[PDB]
C-alpha cells in the first residue's frame, strides 16, 4: 500500500551492524542476489538487502535456504522477514550476516520496484 518504505524495518541494518541485535525479526527488501564462487561445494548466495534507509551487501544465505533462490520465491524486489540470523566476523574484520530462516512476505512480482531510496551502509 501507500507509504511503501513503511513496509520495511527502517533502521534494522544499523541495529544489526552497530548494536549486534540478533533478536529482531526485520522486514527487508531483496535488492540483488548473486552466487559467489565456491567450486565443488554447493553454491552460496550473497544478497544485497534494504531496510528502506540503508542497503547492506554482506548478507549470505544459509545453504538450506538455497531452494528459495533456485525456485525463484526469493528474488530481487521481494520483501521478506528474517526470522533467524547469525553474524560471523572474518579475519579481516568484515562481518557477514547469515540468513538461517526467512519468510517471503511479498513476491518480487507483487512488489515490482526498489522501495524508497536506501543508501549503502558503510561498515
Which residues contact ligand 1XT (rule: CB under 6 A)? 36-37, 46, 58, 60, 62-64, 88, 90, 94, 96, 98
Instruction: State how far the Cα of 53 lies from the Cα of 11, in Å rounded to an integer.
Output: 7
**Contact of 7 with 118, CB cutoff 8 Å:** no
Q: What's the min distance (Å) between Cβ of 42 and ligand 1XT?
A: 9
Q: Which is nearer to ligand 1XT, 7 or 66 (CB)?
A: 66
Smallest distance, Å, CB 59 to ligand 1XT? Answer: 7
Q: Quick one: 57 or 73, whose CB is closer to ligand 1XT?
A: 57
Give the H/E segment covering residue 69: helix 66-70
Beta strand 27-36 pairing with 54-61: unpaired
E strand residue ranges, 1-123: 27-36, 44-50, 54-61, 79-89, 95-106, 119-120
Nearest distance, CB of residue 28 and ligand 1XT, angstroms: 15
State the minimum distance, in angstroms, from the CB of residue 90 to ligand 1XT.
Answer: 6
Amino acid at each position: 500500500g501507500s507509504h511503501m518504505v513503511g513496509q520495511l524495518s527502517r533502521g534494522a541494518i544499523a541495529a544489526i551492524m552497530q548494536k549486534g541485535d540478533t533478536n529482531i525479526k526485520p522486514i527487508l527488501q531483496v535488492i540483488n542476489i548473486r552466487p559467489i564462487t565456491t567450486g565443488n561445494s554447493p553454491p552460496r548466495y550473497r544478497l544485497l538487502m534494504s531496510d528502506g534507509l540503508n542497503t547492506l551487501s554482506s548478507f549470505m544465505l544459509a545453504t538450506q535456504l538455497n531452494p528459495l533462490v533456485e525456485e525463484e520465491q526469493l528474488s530481487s524486489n521481494c520483501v521478506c522477514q528474517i526470522h533467524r540470523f547469525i553474524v560471523n566476523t572474518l579475519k579481516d574484520g568484515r562481518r557477514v550476516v547469515i540468513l538461517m530462516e526467512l519468510e517471503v512476505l511479498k513476491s518480487a512480482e507483487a512488489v515490482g520496484v526498489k522501495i524508497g531510496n536506501p543508501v549503502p551502509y558503510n561498515e
